[PDB]
Motif scaffolding. Structure first.
Motif, mmCIF file in Angstrom:
data_model
loop_
_atom_site.group_PDB
_atom_site.id
_atom_site.type_symbol
_atom_site.label_atom_id
_atom_site.label_comp_id
_atom_site.label_asym_id
_atom_site.label_seq_id
_atom_site.Cartn_x
_atom_site.Cartn_y
_atom_site.Cartn_z
ATOM 1 N N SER A 132 0.827 -1.204 0.000
ATOM 2 C CA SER A 132 0.000 0.000 0.000
ATOM 3 C C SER A 132 0.871 1.267 0.000
ATOM 4 C CB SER A 132 -0.957 -0.005 1.198
ATOM 5 O OG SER A 132 -1.682 -1.218 1.289
ATOM 6 N N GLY A 133 0.231 2.399 -0.259
ATOM 7 C CA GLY A 133 0.888 3.691 -0.345
ATOM 8 C C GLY A 133 1.004 4.143 -1.783
ATOM 9 N N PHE A 134 1.091 5.457 -1.985
ATOM 10 C CA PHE A 134 1.227 6.036 -3.321
ATOM 11 C C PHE A 134 2.018 7.318 -3.201
ATOM 12 C CE2 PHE A 134 0.088 7.397 -7.625
ATOM 13 C CZ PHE A 134 0.350 6.207 -8.265
ATOM 14 N N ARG A 135 3.249 7.279 -3.653
ATOM 15 C CA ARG A 135 4.166 8.393 -3.560
ATOM 16 C C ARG A 135 4.563 8.875 -4.937
ATOM 17 N NH1 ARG A 135 5.568 11.380 1.029
ATOM 18 N NH2 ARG A 135 5.324 10.051 2.880
ATOM 19 N N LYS A 136 4.997 10.128 -5.019
ATOM 20 C CA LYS A 136 5.588 10.682 -6.224
ATOM 21 C C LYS A 136 6.989 10.047 -6.228
ATOM 22 C CE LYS A 136 3.836 13.675 -8.083
ATOM 23 N NZ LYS A 136 3.068 14.905 -8.369
#
Ligand code: R95
Ligand code: R95
Ligand code: CL
Lengths: 296, 305
Positions: free
Chosen positions: A1-5
Motif C-alpha cells: 500500500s501507499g502512493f508516492r511521487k
C-alpha cells in the motif's frame, strides 16, 4: 500500500554528471562516451562559438580535469569532444517526450548531483521544477529495462518560477528561446488522462468515496472538461486506461462521470491519496508500475 | 524558484542492494563491506510470524541455508549473527561499491529518502518522514522488506531505516540499521495498530517560511502569540506540541525572512481556523509537514523573494 511521487533510481545518471566552465559561467554537462553535452548558453551563437578554442572549455569529472579536443553545436546544445570516454556510460537513447509524459530530474550544481524528483512536461511545455542558479545542464530521464532514455536538459527559469529546456538534441520544449528576452509561459491546462490514472490508483489503494453509478459520453465529458481548463480526452487516452479499467471494474467513461462530479462539486472536506487537489503528474504507466513493483 | 519533494540521489545506495533468500522467503539486504544486513524475519514462515522464537529458528540454520545474490553473482555466506531485529550475514567478498557511511537513529519529524527494492533490484526513490506515531507513509508492496531509508548530506550516506512490515492501515514500520524498531512495534503478526497520528508542527512552520522565501505572503497576519497559547490551539487540530527547541531551530529562517517564529505561529493558527479559501501554498491545498527546517534551507535560495 501507499502512493508516492516516485522517481527512477538516479545512479546510472549520476555517473555521467560533470561541471563545465567557460569564462565566468559554470554549469552542468552530461558525459556520455567521449562527448559532454551542455546548454550552448555556457559560451549569434556561431559568432560567439567561432571565437572559442577547445582549451577555453574547462570540464571537470569529480576531481579530474577532462581535456576538450573538439566542439560543435546542435540546435541549443553544445557537444564537447573529450579525450576520455566515460567508463560509467550506461546503455542510453535520446528521446523527445510529449506534454503529459513524466520523467525524473537529477538536479545538479557544479557537476555534483544534489537531488532527484519526479515531474511532468506541462501542456504549456514548461516544467514545474525546483532549480536555483547553477542548475543549468541538469537532465530529465526515464529508465526502461537497463536503458536510460534522456529526454530533457535544463536551460532556464521563466518569470513565473517555472522552467524551460530542450531535448538532448537541443530542440526546445515550447516556444522558448535561449536568450534574455520577454518570454512567458502560456496558460496551462490539467492533464486529464493523468488525473484519471491517479483516480484509478486511489481506487486500487481503497479510496472509493468519489465513485458513482453514472456514466457519460466522451463528447459530454470533453464539453465539461474544456470548461475547467482540462486537456481534451481522446479515444487513445481511453484505450491507454483500458488495463486499469479492467483491474478495478470501473469503465473509463464511468470514472469520467466521477471526475465531472468532482469538478462541479469539489471534494467537500475530503482528500484522495492524501491530496485536496486533483493530481495530474502520474501517467497510466506510472500507476501500473508503482502498483506492480517494476525494477531496474 | 520552485519547491519539490526532493529525494537524495540514490546511486550510492543502489550499489549496496542485494537479494536474500532463506527457504521460500526472498527479500532485500544491504551489503556494506563484507556484511549483508537484512530483516531477521527472512528465517520465518508465515505460520512462525504469530509467535516466532528467532533464537530457536536461527540456531537451526547454517551459513549455506542463506542464499545472497548481488546482481548476477552468488555471494558466499561465511557467518551469521542476530542484532535486535536485524540479521547480519558475513560474506566472503567485500562490496567494492561500499560508500562512506554511518548508521544513525532518527527522531519523529525527520525526513529521509527511501530506495524501494524488489528481489535486490531498485525500482524507485521517494522522500518521506518518520511520523510522530513512529510509522512511515511509504509505498511498499510484498517483497519490499529490507529496502532502506537514508540521507546523504555531503558524500557520506547515513542509513536510518530498514523496512520490515505493513500495518493494517497501509502505513509502514521498520528499524534503524542496528535492528531497533521505531515505535512500539514488533516483528510478529500480532494485533498491532498505529497510534493516532499528528501533524509535525515545526515542519509546517518551515514550509510556511519556504513559501515566504519563494515570494508568497498572503497567509501572514498582524498578530503574534505566546508559545503556550499556540500549543493550546495546535493541540485542538491534532498538531504536535511546538517546543523551545523547535523555536530555536527555526531561528535561521526567521532571520532570513524577517518574520519572528511566534508571528509565523500566529499565521499558522489563523490558517487552521480559516482554511485556504480556494488558495494554495507552494502548489498545495493542504499544510505540508514532510519538509524539515534543514530541508528548506538546503533546497531554497539564500535570497528571499
Ligand atoms: C532572470 N534570469 C532567470 C531567472 N529567474 S537570469 O538569472 O538572468 N537568467 C537569464 C537566462 C536567459 C536565458 C537562458 Cl537560456 C538562461 C538564463 C539563466 C537562467 O534562467 N538560469 C536559471 C535556471 N534555473 C533556475 C534559475 C533560478 C534562479 C536564477 C536563474 C535560474 C540566467
Ligand atoms: C498481512 N501482512 C502485511 C500486510 N498487508 S503479511 O503480508 O501477512 N505480512 C505479515 C508480516 C508481519 C510482520 C512482519 Cl515483521 C512482516 C510481515 C510481512 C509484511 O508486512 N510484508 C510487507 C511489507 N511492506 C509492504 C507490504 C505490502 C503488502 C504485503 C506485504 C507487505 C508479511
Ligand atoms: Cl533526527
Amino acid at each position: 500500500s501507499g502512493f508516492r511521487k516516485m522517481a527512477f533510481p538516479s545512479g546510472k545518471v549520476e555517473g555521467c554528471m560533470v561541471q563545465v566552465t567557460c569564462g565566468t559561467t559554470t554549469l552542468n554537462g552530461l558525459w556520455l562516451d567521449d562527448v559532454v553535452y551542455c546548454p550552448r548558453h555556457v559560451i549569434n551563437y556561431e559568432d560567439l562559438l567561432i571565437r572559442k578554442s577547445n582549451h577555453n572549455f574547462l570540464v571537470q569529472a569529480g576531481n579530474v580535469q577532462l581535456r576538450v579536443i573538439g566542439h560543435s553545436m546542435q540546435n541549443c546544445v553544445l557537444k564537447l569532444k573529450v579525450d576520455t570516454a566515460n567508463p560509467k556510460t550506461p546503455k542510453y537513447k535520446f528521446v523527445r517526450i510529449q506534454p503529459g509524459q513524466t520523467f525524473s530530474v537529477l538536479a545538479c550544481y557544479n557537476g555534483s548531483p544534489s537531488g532527484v524528483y519526479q515531474c511532468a512536461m506541462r501542456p504549456n511545455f514548461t516544467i514545474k521544477g525546483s532549480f536555483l542558479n547553477g542548475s543549468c545542464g541538469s537532465v530529465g530521464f526515464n529508465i526502461d529495462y537497463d536503458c536510460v532514455s534522456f529526454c530533457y536538459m535544463h536551460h532556464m527559469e521563466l518569470p513565473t518560477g517555472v522552467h524551460a529546456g530542450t531535448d538532448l538534441e537541443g530542440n526546445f520544449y515550447g516556444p522558448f528561446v535561449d536568450r534574455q528576452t520577454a518570454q512567458a509561459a502560456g496558460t496551462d491546462t490539467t492533464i486529464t488522462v493523468n488525473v484519471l490514472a491517479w483516480l484509478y490508483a486511489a481506487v486500487i489503494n481503497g479510496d472509493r468515496w468519489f465513485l458513482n453509478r453514472f456514466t457519460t459520453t466522451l463528447n459530454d465529458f470533453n464539453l465539461v472538461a474544456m470548461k475547467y481548463n482540462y486537456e481534451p480526452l481522446t479515444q487513445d487516452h481511453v484505450d491507454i486506461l483500458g488495463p486499469l479499467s479492467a483491474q478495478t471494474g470501473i469503465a473509463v467513461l464511468d470514472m469520467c462521470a466521477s471526475l465531472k462530479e468532482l469538478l462541479q462539486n469539489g471534494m467537500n472536506g475530503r482528500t484522495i491519496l492524501g491530496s485536496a487537489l486533483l493530481e495530474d503528474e502520474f501517467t497510466p504507466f506510472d500507476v501500473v508500475r508503482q502498483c506492480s513493483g517494476v525494477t531496474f
